[PDB]
Amino acid sequence: RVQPTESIVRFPNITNLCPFGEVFNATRFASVYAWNRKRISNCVADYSVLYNSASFSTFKCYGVSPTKLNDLCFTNVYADSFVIRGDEVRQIAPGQTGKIADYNYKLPDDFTGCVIAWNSNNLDSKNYNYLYRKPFERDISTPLQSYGFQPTNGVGYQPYRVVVLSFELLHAPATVCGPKKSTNLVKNKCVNFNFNGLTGTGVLTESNKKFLPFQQFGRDIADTTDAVRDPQTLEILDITPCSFGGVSVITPGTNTSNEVAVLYQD
């Protein structure tokens, strides 16, 4: 195998720090039946800040890993903000049922994302503002029972603020990227390229392919990325694989000599 001569980290020219301060340090949270979904787009989002914060009571990534969260760039990120009872923390998972899981907030089975929650007993409890009763069904029609949140109650009766960081997967030009330093794009070398999480190894050549403008990367018959579009330069680059072949040693036998001839295959 021709070994990769270099590596390419390629991310688009976005420098925006991502607003998690209005999400996790919010002065008000929604109820579980009227949950606040906030669209997050076009930002350099560092999720290691959320992962290294010890103020969070739980951290459950399912489709990805929190160490790999900064290594991937997402298309669309939605933060399901709701204030729920801490006993129903375990209902925020794929394939469950409950008072919040089956009525107030249904979460999909094939869910790719992370769920972060923390106690808000010193913030929301004093209170009956937060009420409860298909995926992502926000039914707000009124039949609605309120939460009895008080700070002198038990741990299972303490108010907990839950943010469900759902991530739409990469089938498109992505916009919500992580803190990755972009590199210069070397052409006609076997490189370990990285186009917003589309890692791989091959020879990057210029191509005459005409993408549609809503398409990030082309694909092949073998479900492999045949071509990409550079997120900083609107050009269509093929990925030719590195030249590989078997090794076949021609030997006349050790009874005659130790001199061998190496035939490479095709």
């Binding site: 489709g63 990805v64 890993s65 160490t67 790999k68 290594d71 991937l72 790719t112 999480g197 589309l198 890692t199 791989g200 018959i221 073998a222 479900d223 492999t224």
Partner: protein
């Protein structure tokens, strides 16, 4: 085309599993992929010999 089959993995792309997941789950998904591709290859080699 049998490269594109997931065999229950989150993707049929190996690099996506390696870049998304920690190895304690990624090894399980990769194990499913090796099982599926190895079964497909053994079926192919059997057809090849016959």
């Amino acid at each position: 085309k049998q490269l594109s089959s997931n065999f229950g993995a989150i993707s049929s792309v190996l690099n996506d599993i390696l870049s998304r997941l920690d190895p304690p789950e990624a090894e399980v998904q990769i194990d499913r992929l090796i099982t599926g591709r190895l079964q497909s290859l053994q079926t192919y080699v059997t057809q090849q010999l016959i």
